[PDB]
C-alpha cells in the first residue's frame, strides 16, 4: 500500500480514522513535527520518528481532535475516529506551496571544453584575453567544400591556443548547406560559424573563426 495523502490549507481539518490496537503514523514530507496536542487521555504514547513524523497510539473509543504543528510554522488539525485494525499511515501535504526554490544547474563541463568556449566568445566580441598579442593568420586551416575562397582577416596568438578569422567568399549558384565539420583540417581544435549557417545561398560572405593549437606543429 502507499501512505494516504491528504492536502490541507493551514488550519485545515481532515476527518481520518486511526487505530486503537496498533501504532499510527503521520508524516509531513519536507517537514518535521515539532508538537502534537490532543484532548487529554486520548493519546497513549507519542514519539518522533526519523525524518520527522509522529508515531502515536490511542486507547480511546471517542472521536477526537489532534493538532499537529510543523517546524515551518504550519499547523493542521485532524479529527480521529479510533477503529479496530492495522496502524494507518497518512502523508500530509500543503495545498499551497509556500515558495518555489529556483532550479540549480550542477553540471560542470570539462576544462578543455570551457577553454575553447571562452576563447570563441572572446573572439566573437573582440576583447582580448591577456597574453593574446595578434599574429598573421595562415592559409593551412580551411578545407573548402567548393565555390569558396578564403581570405584571412584577423588572428590572435597566445600561450596555449591560437585563433584566426577567415572570410569565405560567396559560393556559385547552388545553395551550399554549411557543415561545421566539412571545413576540418588535422590540428584544429574547434571550428565555429558566425551567424547561423543553414545554407549560404547563391552567395554570401560569412566570417568563420578557426581555433588551432599553439606552439605545437
Amino acid at each position: 500500500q502507499s501512505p494516504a495523502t491528504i492536502s490541507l490549507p493551514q488550519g485545515g481539518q481532515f476527518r481520518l480514522s486511526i487505530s486503537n490496537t496498533d501504532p499510527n503514523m503521520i508524516f509531513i514530507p519536507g517537514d518535521k513535527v515539532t508538537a502534537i496536542t490532543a484532548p487529554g487521555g486520548m493519546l497513549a504514547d507519542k514519539r518522533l520518528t526519523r525524518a520527522g513524523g509522529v508515531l502515536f497510539t490511542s486507547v480511546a473509543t471517542r472521536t477526537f481532535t489532534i493538532f499537529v504543528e510543523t517546524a515551518r510554522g504550519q499547523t493542521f488539525s485532524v479529527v480521529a475516529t479510533p477503529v479496530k485494525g492495522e496502524g494507518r499511515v497518512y502523508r500530509l501535504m500543503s495545498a499551497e506551496p509556500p515558495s518555489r526554490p529556483e532550479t540549480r544547474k550542477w553540471e560542470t563541463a570539462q576544462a578543455y571544453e570551457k577553454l575553447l568556449i571562452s576563447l570563441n566568445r572572446a573572439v566573437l566580441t573582440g576583447d582580448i584575453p591577456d597574453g593574446y598579442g595578434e599574429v598573421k593568420p595562415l592559409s593551412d586551416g580551411i578545407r573548402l567544400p567548393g565555390g569558396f575562397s578564403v581570405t584571412p582577416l584577423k588572428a590572435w596568438a597566445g600561450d596555449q591556443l591560437r585563433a584566426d578569422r577567415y572570410e569565405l567568399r560567396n559560393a556559385n549558384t547552388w545553395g551550399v548547406a554549411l557543415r561545421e565539420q566539412d571545413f576540418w583540417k588535422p590540428g584544429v581544435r574547434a571550428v565555429m560559424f558566425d551567424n547561423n549557417a543553414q545554407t549560404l545561398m547563391g552567395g554570401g560572405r560569412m566570417t568563420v573563426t578557426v581555433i588551432r593549437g599553439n606552439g605545437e606543429g
Binding site: Y112, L161, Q181, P186, G187, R189, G213, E216
Partner: peptide, 15 residues
C-alpha cells in the same frame, strides 16, 4: 592540452 587524437574519418541519414 588534450590529445585531439582523431584525424576525422576521410572521404536521420546525416553523414
Amino acid at each position: 592540452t588534450v590529445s585531439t587524437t582523431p584525424p576525422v574519418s576521410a572521404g536521420v541519414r546525416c553523414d
